[PDB]
Amino acid sequence: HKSEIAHRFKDLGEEHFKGLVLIAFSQYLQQCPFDEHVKLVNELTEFAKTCVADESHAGCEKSLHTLFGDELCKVASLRETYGDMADCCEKQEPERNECFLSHKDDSPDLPKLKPDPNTLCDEFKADEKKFWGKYLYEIARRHPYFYAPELLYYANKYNGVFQECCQAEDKGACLLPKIETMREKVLASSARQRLRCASIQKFGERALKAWSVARLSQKFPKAEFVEVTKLVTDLTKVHKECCHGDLLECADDRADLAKYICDNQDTISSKLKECCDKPLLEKSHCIAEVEKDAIPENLPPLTADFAEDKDVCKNYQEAKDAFLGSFLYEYSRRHPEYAVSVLLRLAKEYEATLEECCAKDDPHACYSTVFDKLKHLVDEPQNLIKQNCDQFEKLGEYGFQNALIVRYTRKVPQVSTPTLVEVSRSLGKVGTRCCTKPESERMPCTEDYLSLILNRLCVLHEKTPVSEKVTKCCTESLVNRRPCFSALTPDETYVPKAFDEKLFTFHADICTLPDTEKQIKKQTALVELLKHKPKATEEQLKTVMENFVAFVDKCCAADDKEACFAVEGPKLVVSTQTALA
Numbered sequence: 076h077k078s079e080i081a082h083r084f085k086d087l088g089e090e091h092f093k094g095l096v097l098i099a100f101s102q103y104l105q106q107c108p109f110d111e112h113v114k115l116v117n118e119l120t121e122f123a124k125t126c127v128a129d130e131s132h133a134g135c136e137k138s139l140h141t142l143f144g145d146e147l148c149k150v151a152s153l154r155e156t157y158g159d160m161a162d163c164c165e166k167q168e169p170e171r172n173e174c175f176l177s178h179k180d181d182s183p184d185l186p187k188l189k190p191d192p193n194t195l196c197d198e199f200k201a202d203e204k205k206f207w208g209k210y211l212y213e214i215a216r217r218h219p220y221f222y223a224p225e226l227l228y229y230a231n232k233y234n235g236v237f238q239e240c241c242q243a244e245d246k247g248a249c250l251l252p253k254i255e256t257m258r259e260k261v262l263a264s265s266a267r268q269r270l271r272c273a274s275i276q277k278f279g280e281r282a283l284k285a286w287s288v289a290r291l292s293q294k295f296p297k298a299e300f301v302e303v304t305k306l307v308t309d310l311t312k313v314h315k316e317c318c319h320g321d322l323l324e325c326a327d328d329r330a331d332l333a334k335y336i337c338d339n340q341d342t343i344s345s346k347l348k349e350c351c352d353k354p355l356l357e358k359s360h361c362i363a364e365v366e367k368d369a370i371p372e373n374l375p376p377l378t379a380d381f382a383e384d385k386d387v388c389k390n391y392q393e394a395k396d397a398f399l400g401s402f403l404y405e406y407s408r409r410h411p412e413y414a415v416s417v418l419l420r421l422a423k424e425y426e427a428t429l430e431e432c433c434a435k436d437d438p439h440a441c442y443s444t445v446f447d448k449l450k451h452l453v454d455e456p457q458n459l460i461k462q463n464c465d466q467f468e469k470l471g472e473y474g475f476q477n478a479l480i481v482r483y484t485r486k487v488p489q490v491s492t493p494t495l496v497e498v499s500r501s502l503g504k505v506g507t508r509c510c511t512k513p514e515s516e517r518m519p520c521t522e523d524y525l526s527l528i529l530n531r532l533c534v535l536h537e538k539t540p541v542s543e544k545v546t547k548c549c550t551e552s553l554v555n556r557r558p559c560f561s562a563l564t565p566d567e568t569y570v571p572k573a574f575d576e577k578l579f580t581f582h583a584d585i586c587t588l589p590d591t592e593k594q595i596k597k598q599t600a601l602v603e604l605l606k607h608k609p610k611a612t613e614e615q616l617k618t619v620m621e622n623f624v625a626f627v628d629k630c631c632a633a634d635d636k637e638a639c640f641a642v643e644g645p646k647l648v649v650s651t652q653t654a655l656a
């Protein structure tokens with residue numbers, strides 16, 4: 076086992092090999108053209124084939140990141156295009172590789188793909204392998220933290236849609252509904268992975284480890300604790316390597332894990348038979364999306380192991396993370412109706428109970444009643460969903476977006492405008508994704524997605540920190556972000572923004588831009604409105620909104636759009652400044 080490059084090549088095969096290397100280069104250099112990365116992939120691939128033939132050949136024993144870093148440093152346009160990135164190549168390993176990772180851009184400013192089915196189906200028949208790569212390069216360059224083995228899965232189902240749609244009479248009718256159903260899933264998968272990496276890089280291995288204990292024991296209530304711990308150890312390693320750019324080691328270990336569980340179905344879960352007959356990529360995705368198993372019939376009451384035992388303090392101190400891991404497992408298995416975001420909050424609260432109770436001279440009097448305290452955590456969110464689902468159904472998606480945009484801009488005005496827009500749009504979609512579900516399931520849906528969206532706000536905010544209120548809730552804890560943001564109030568410590576005419580001038584292009592761009596442009600001007608008038612009441616904001624709708628509709632219809640915006644524009648500013656100031 077003397078050549079890491081050869082060990083990886085043999086295990087995944089050339090096609091997967093080229094795929095993940097193109098991913099790694101796409102996430103490292105997101106602005107570099109597609110063709111330049113293919114040569115890098117092709118060059119490194121031939122060298123790998125040389126090492127499989129001869130392992131004693133020069134350079135075959137070097138670490139993966141070295142070879143990757145070596146080829147990255149030869150890019151003639153490294154400095155002039157990525158700036159300070161070009162000083163990474165002055166470092167040794169592993170400080171050099173860490174210098175690259177720190178430059179992954181979560182807001183790459185990349186154009187928005189407008190796929191046209193005619194030219195797109197033409198590119199597929201031209202070369203089925205090249206089109207496969209183009210999707211890889213385009214998805215990975217806008218999401219540099221994507222779970223790489225899943226991107227290949229999405230890439231195969233991509234060509235699969237084309238395989239069946241480019242042969243129909245109405246291509247457009249076949250392609251566009253399938254790809255949009257996919258586009259939502261890949262963004263949801265990118266946000267999930269971005270939160271997993273955020274856990275380790277900002278809260279430690281124990282944070283991602285405890286997340287796996289939650290979901291696994293939830294999905295696999297039959298597997299005993301020793302079995303769950305085994306899967307957790309290897310799964311956390313899989314995510315640890317993927318989040319660290321160790322894509323080749325990540326995929327290989329995901330394949331090794333998917334192989335282990337299928338050969339151990341009887342001791343894990345009974346709903347994996349169908350999941351364990353698909354090919355490699357399909358199988359692993361099936362495993363992650365598998366239905367949960369049935370709760371055992373005669374489970375001992377939770378109070379037994381963690382409340383009345385006169386040795387809870389003893390068993391805790393000897394193996395804290397193991398004793399706590401046992402608690403999450405026992406609680407996650409018996410309660411699959413809880414959201415993951417909820418269960419770790421119960422374990423984190425139980426942890427805080429043990430540290431302080433065992434300090435007291437009579438810990439037994441202190442921790443025996445912890446479950447009464449814990450039971451009260453589940454009901455605290457319960458009324459937030461209702462107030463949000465009622466507002467939701469009343470105003471609708473688009474109106475609900477502007478509702479939170481108004482509410483949350485008043486809470487954290489210092490945040491930059493493109494962030495408040497993007498985040499407030501995603502939060503409103505949680506209504507369409509959760510408030511139509513059954514009532515007793517509306518709360519698990521919300522908290523799950525909220526933790527994926529609030530992590531985006533933090534991820535976008537830690538790059539350019541401008542708000543202390545946001546930094547506090549993002550770094551205090553990983554589980555209590557949703558209550559920490561919901562508990563924020565509009566503070567009178569924020570000075571309103573000075574008036575900017577350019578942020579309220581409109582042109583005839585508003586009648587041309589795509590629908591998403593029309594709404595984003597309108598919501599961007601809305602955010603700037605509150606940054607200037609943070610205390611404008613809801614009745615006045617209602618007035619301005621209708622005045623702006625009538626403004627846009629009027630001028631998108633006249634014979635001369637330019638002269639209409641010319642005249643009516645200033646009029647709107649006057650009436651708005653009068654009504655609000």
Ligand SMILES: CN(C)c1ccc2cc(/C=C/c3cc[n+](C)cc3)ccc2c1
Pocket residue numbers: 085086087088
């Ligand atoms: C796609 N491809 C070329 C291949 C070919 C062969 C592969 C073998 C293994 C494990 C092989 C083994 C190793 C050790 N024992 C005791 C049994 C089996 C894993 C992935 C593979 C991938």
Ligand SMILES: CN(C)c1ccc2cc(/C=C/c3cc[n+](C)cc3)ccc2c1
Pocket residue numbers: 087088089090091203204207234235
């Ligand atoms: C465009 N498209 C639908 C298709 C169809 C079939 C494809 C097969 C491969 C081979 C993958 C492999 C090759 C060699 N070993 C040892 C294992 C796996 C790669 C991409 C494909 C793309």
Ligand SMILES: CN(C)c1ccc2cc(/C=C/c3cc[n+](C)cc3)ccc2c1
Pocket residue numbers: 465468469
């Ligand atoms: C406090 N409570 C038990 C609840 C809960 C949910 C409720 C929903 C509605 C529907 C409101 C609507 C009606 C029609 N459109 C088109 C949208 C929304 C009315 C009262 C409610 C009262």
